[PDB]
Curated annotation (Swiss-Prot), chain A:
Required for ribosomal protein bS1 (rpsA) to bind to the 30S subunit. Keywords: Ribonucleoprotein, Ribosomal protein. Gene3D superfamilies: Glucose-6-phosphate isomerase like protein, domain 1, Helix hairpin bin. Part of the 30S ribosomal subunit, contacts bS1. Some nascent polypeptide chains are able to cross-link to this protein in situ. In collided ribosomes contacts ribosome rescue factor SmrB. HAMAP family: Ribosomal_uS2_B (MF_00291_B). One of its GO terms (cellular component) is cytoplasm. The keyword Ribosomal protein applies. Belongs to the universal ribosomal protein uS2 family. This is Small ribosomal subunit protein uS2. It comes from Escherichia coli (strain K12).
Swiss-Prot record, chain B:
Residues 10-73 form the S5 DRBM domain. Disulfide bonds: none annotated. Signal peptide: none annotated. The N-terminal domain interacts with the head of the 30S subunit; the C-terminal domain interacts with the body and contacts protein uS4. The interaction surface between uS4 and uS5 is involved in control of translational fidelity. SUPFAM superfamilies: dsRNA-binding domain-like (SSF54768), Ribosomal protein S5 domain 2-like (SSF54211). The keyword Ribosomal protein applies. The gene is rpsE. Belongs to the universal ribosomal protein uS5 family. Keywords: Acetylation, Antibiotic resistance, Ribonucleoprotein, Ribosomal protein, RNA-binding, rRNA-binding. One of its GO terms (molecular function) is structural constituent of ribosome. This is Small ribosomal subunit protein uS5. It holds the Pfam family Ribosomal_S5_C.
From Swiss-Prot, chain D:
This is Small ribosomal subunit protein uS8. Belongs to the universal ribosomal protein uS8 family. The lineage of its organism: Bacteria, Pseudomonadati, Pseudomonadota, Gammaproteobacteria, Enterobacterales. InterPro entries: Ribosomal_uS8, Ribosomal_uS8_CS, Ribosomal_uS8_sf. One of its GO terms (molecular function) is structural constituent of ribosome.
UniProtKB/Swiss-Prot annotation, chain E:
Pfam families: Ribosomal_S15. It comes from Escherichia coli O157:H7. This is Small ribosomal subunit protein uS15. The gene is rpsO. The lineage of its organism: Bacteria, Pseudomonadati, Pseudomonadota, Gammaproteobacteria, Enterobacterales. The keyword Glycosyltransferase does not apply. Belongs to the universal ribosomal protein uS15 family. Part of the 30S ribosomal subunit. Forms a bridge to the 50S subunit in the 70S ribosome, contacting the 23S rRNA.
RNA sequence: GUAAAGCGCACGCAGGCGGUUUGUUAAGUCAGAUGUGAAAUCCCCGGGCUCAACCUGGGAACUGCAUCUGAUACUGGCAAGCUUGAGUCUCGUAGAGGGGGGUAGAAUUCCAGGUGUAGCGGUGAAAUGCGUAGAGAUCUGGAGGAAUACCGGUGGCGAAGGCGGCCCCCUGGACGAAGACUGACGCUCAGGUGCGAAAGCGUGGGGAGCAAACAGGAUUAGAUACCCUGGUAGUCCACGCCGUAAACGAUGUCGACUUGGAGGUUGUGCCCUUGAGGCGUGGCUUCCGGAGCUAACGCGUUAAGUCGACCGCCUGGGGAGUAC
């Protein structure tokens, strides 16, 4: 979409920093240092980013469910406001081994989480000794903390929403085995390598990790909306 | 499954079975190991090494790994024109284009694996390690870049691939 | 390395295939017995095996196995021997043709006829 | 130092296509042009220019189909010190004639198909895989 | 290392009259002139082997530059070789 | 690289090879042309004996060799360029490269005098040694020989192993930079001359400490190994004798190419030079990782990649680096 060219400049003038360390495999989109601070190249990034948004629009009519991974402290609040409701899922308490490949065990442990959470809230195990409630309380806590932003997920997702590759390589690894397209925002120490569409970015400046994500979020969500309204119209024409 | 070729009913090419144990910490290990190849007669990369506590579960794990994240390979049944100087972990093969009128000699189970591979006619004797696991790599690394043209335009064939890169 | 390098100094290969020192490129050979031996195995074992030393016609000397029950060798006779190594005993490179020269076939052999040298065997 | 310059041409293409470069430049020769022409029409390079008023110098554009390599390697067979010559009746077969040997005959540089159509033999420069 | 004032006399006397340092004749005459300077050190210092390594570089290279002139013009060569008193 | 296997290294004749262009030839090259190659038992097309074995006409690998005539795309020759290989002048710069000179203080050690009394030493614990002739240590002053810590750092240098007190004489090799020149004068290297980490080593010089042996102690189922005390050649210089090796990248020589960032640190252009910093361009040096390669570790722009020419070297173990 046309949104990517306006979005990149407005966000980017923090320039990142990350000392002079940076990552050589991202280097073409990294402009040369000014006294041991890294500076991003904002011009070469606009073809990549416009490319990403057109593919997002085409999946809109394809998806009911999005999965946001690669979340971190400085980024969490932007990942929440893009999800809005339980048709858009996210992981922020670290990824678990097999969340896509062993969805079979993962969905089983989610079904035990929503069964014992609805048991807790009616009040059913809270009678007797504190030991008998607390051993259920602790196991529910571990499932709730591990699952909390994916607990509702009605099936294997159509896409993968990445805000960092820095700690989250596995999610991407399995998403590629599952045959899922990744739509990425990578930082300066990240590599561009190995995911389907990239936005080159930097991990600092809370205004930049929001604006980057804000552009990615609009295209799929108002995209889906427009597909649904076109679905209503096709039957309603007949009966009037 | 996923990117897998237009396969029809299962290939159940069991190549090997073994059983492994340290026995160091609590009696022996009972679990078994399996090596299995799943193709389609037209040329595939499907090769799966898997394991479980008893043989039936060992093969079914191994057969999944033989069939998921495997690219189509486009040879024409029994003719192939463009092999590779095949190397896998010291086990080395070097097929070249050839008539099927001439026949195939190959030892053990191997003339049988090669006839389901579609690569029997180009094939020539292995060299490097003659270990059961790596001797069968004829149809994987030896086809990793390939074509098999039937077209009268065979002499324009590399031209046709450049003007798509243009 | 280089091909010119191969014109300047040739290829040379692994050691050729031998374990029978019989001379004249032949599987069987004659000699006169010098000694008969009761002897004990190599590898971890206990037996009383039969070997003869024969002094072959080339004047070298070899040790040959005397297989099956029922001993008939004499320690100064002319016999034919056939190469075929024995791993049970150290440096034993031969077996003796039980049907040849001064040899007689094994008692309670019917397993093979020509092999271990029995004319119309007994049970 | 410089002992075979058409193998050094070929190594510059070879690392060129593996390293995702669009064009590869080196010193030019009458032999280099004469080769490049055959590659250009058989699509093993896309196009080239020859440029330099002092001494000629060659810039060429690589073989691709999607953006990464579809010829694995190109190697010289006749070389400095190991010249190999083929007769009219003995012109070679490279990946069943989907691939080329570039063959310098007395009448010029051409492909194995044209050396055979002429009824010449000559020097076998390089094969594809 | 050779003196500024010898190097300028050598250039005046050897190669062509342009007073260049590059042509084959003036390059033998300059190499000779350092070789000779170094042989002045080797009037003593007979256990100083690591610098003798250096001598053989300059010497070998002169051997090569003599072959080259003699592959080219013989007048320059028969003059030069007699003109620096080289060999027997 | 380590499984067997890079020459110990520089330099280099013979041999082998040769960036790039014009002139020109035609050794090798290739096409053309002509002649040779008996016969089946083999191979192919025929034929015959009850098939087949067997035998055979015609065709053929007839398993082998030939030269003239044409070509100049390639290599070989040769002349003159070109620079794109390499070579050279004065200048600056960094460093433990080499040979010979000069020089100081400090502990052990020693001697003399002064002061002064009983252990000193050694260790796992121990005893041999040394000592009342006065030791050990300590004050003053002298003596003598190697060595010269730190600075010494992921630094720098040498041909590889190799190089470290400080200075000078004599001089190499390497790193940059401006003016200027020649113009393949190139590459590698069998044989080759030249050159030692260390000790071994002939004589002179020299000896403070340390030490194989040799004595004696201690250890222990014995103890030449283990562990201790005495103690000599050596170590130290000068010249001289075969250069051994774990002689390193356990990685051949030197050259071309391949996404890079950053550390250490230096020539030099540019910076409030403002962060051992940034950028332009060489320099050695090192972490990190892509393409590629590996059995594996690992290598990765200083390769262990893609390669280049030419060379060295390996081909199962023991027995043998010995025998000859």
């Amino acid at each position: 979409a046309t949104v990517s060219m306006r979005d990149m400049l407005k966000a980017g003038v923090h320039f990142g920093h990350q000392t002079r360390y940076w990552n050589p495999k991202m280097k073409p989109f990294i402009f040369g240092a000014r006294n041991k601070v890294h500076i991003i190249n904002l011009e070469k990034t606009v073809p990549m980013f416009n490319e990403a948004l057109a593919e997002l629009n085409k999946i809109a009519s394809r998806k009911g469910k999005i999965l946001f991974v690669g979340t971190k402290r400085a980024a969490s609040e932007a990942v929440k406001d893009a999800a809005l409701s339980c048709d858009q899922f996210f992981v922020n308490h670290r990824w678990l081994g097999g969340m896509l490949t062993n969805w079979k065990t993962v969905r089983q442990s989610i079904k035990r989480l929503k069964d014992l959470e609805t048991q807790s809230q009616d009040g059913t195990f809270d009678k007797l000794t504190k030991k008998e409630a607390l051993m259920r309380t602790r196991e529910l806590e571990k499932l709730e903390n591990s699952l909390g932003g994916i607990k509702d997920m009605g099936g294997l997702p159509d896409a993968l929403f990445v805000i960092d590759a820095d700690h989250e390589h596995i999610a991407i690894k399995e998403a590629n085995n599952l045959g899922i397209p990744v739509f990425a925002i990578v930082d300066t120490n990240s590599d561009p390598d190995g995911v389907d569409f990239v936005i080159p970015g930097n991990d600092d400046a809370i205004r930049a990790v929001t604006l980057y994500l804000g552009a990615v979020a609009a295209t799929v969500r108002e995209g889906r909306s427009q597909d649904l309204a076109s679905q209503a119209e096709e039957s309603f024409v007949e009966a009037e | 499954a996923h990117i897998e070729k237009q396969a029809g009913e299962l290939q159940e090419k069991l190549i090997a079975v073994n059983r492994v144990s340290k026995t160091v910490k609590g009696g022996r290990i009972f679990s078994f190991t399996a090596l299995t190849v799943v193709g389609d007669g037209n040329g595939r990369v499907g090769f799966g090494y898997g394991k479980a506590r008893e043989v039936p579960a060992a093969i079914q794990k191994a057969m999944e790994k033989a069939r998921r994240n495997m690219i189509n390979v486009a040879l024409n049944n029994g003719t192939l024109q463009h092999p590779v100087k095949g190397v896998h972990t010291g086990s080395r093969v070097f097929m070249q284009p050839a008539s099927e009128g001439t026949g195939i000699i190959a030892g053990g189970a191997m003339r049988a694996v090669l006839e389901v591979a579609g690569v029997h006619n180009v094939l020539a004797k292995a060299y490097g390690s003659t270990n059961p696991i790596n001797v069968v790599r004829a149809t994987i690394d030896g086809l990793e870049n390939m074509n098999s043209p039937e077209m009268v335009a065979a002499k324009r064939g590399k031209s046709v691939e450049e003007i798509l890169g243009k | 390395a280089t091909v010119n390098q191969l014109v300047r100094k040739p290829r040379a290969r692994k050691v050729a295939k031998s374990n029978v020192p019989a001379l004249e490129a032949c599987p069987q050979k004659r000699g006169v017995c010098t000694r008969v031996y009761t002897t004990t195995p190599k590898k971890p074992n206990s037996a009383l095996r039969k070997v003869c030393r024969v002094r072959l016609t080339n004047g070298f000397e070899v040790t040959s196995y005397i297989g099956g029950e029922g001993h008939n060798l004499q320690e100064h006779s002319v016999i034919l021997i056939r190469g075929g190594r024995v791993k049970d005993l150290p440096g034993v490179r031969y077996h003796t043709v039980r049907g040849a020269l001064d040899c007689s076939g094994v008692k309670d052999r019917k397993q093979a006829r020509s092999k271990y040298g029995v004319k119309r065997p007994k049970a | 130092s410089m002992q075979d310059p058409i193998a050094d041409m070929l190594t510059r293409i070879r690392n060129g296509q593996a390293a995702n470069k669009a064009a590869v430049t080196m010193p030019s020769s009458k032999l280099k042009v004469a080769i490049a022409n055959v590659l250009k029409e058989e699509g093993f390079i896309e196009d080239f220019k020859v440029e330099g008023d002092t001494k000629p110098e060659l810039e060429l554009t690589l073989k691709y189909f999607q953006g990464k390599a579809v010829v694995e390697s190109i190697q010289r067979v006749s070389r400095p010190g190991l010249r190999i010559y083929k007769r009219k009746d003995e012109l070679p077969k490279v990946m069943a004639g989907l691939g080329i040997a570039v063959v310098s005959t007395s009448k010029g540089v051409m492909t194995d198909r044209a050396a055979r159509q002429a009824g010449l033999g000559g020097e076998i420069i390089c094969y594809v895989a | 290392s050779l003196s500024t004032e010898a190097t300028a006399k050598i250039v005046s006397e050897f190669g062509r009259d342009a007073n260049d340092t590059g042509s084959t004749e003036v390059q033998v005459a300059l190499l000779t002139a350092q070789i000779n300077h170094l042989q002045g050190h080797f009037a003593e210092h007979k256990k100083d082997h690591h610098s003798r390594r250096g001598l053989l570089r300059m010497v070998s290279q002169r051997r090569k530059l003599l072959d080259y002139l003699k592959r080219k013009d013989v007048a320059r060569y028969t003059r030069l070789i007699e003109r620096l008193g080289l060999r027997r």
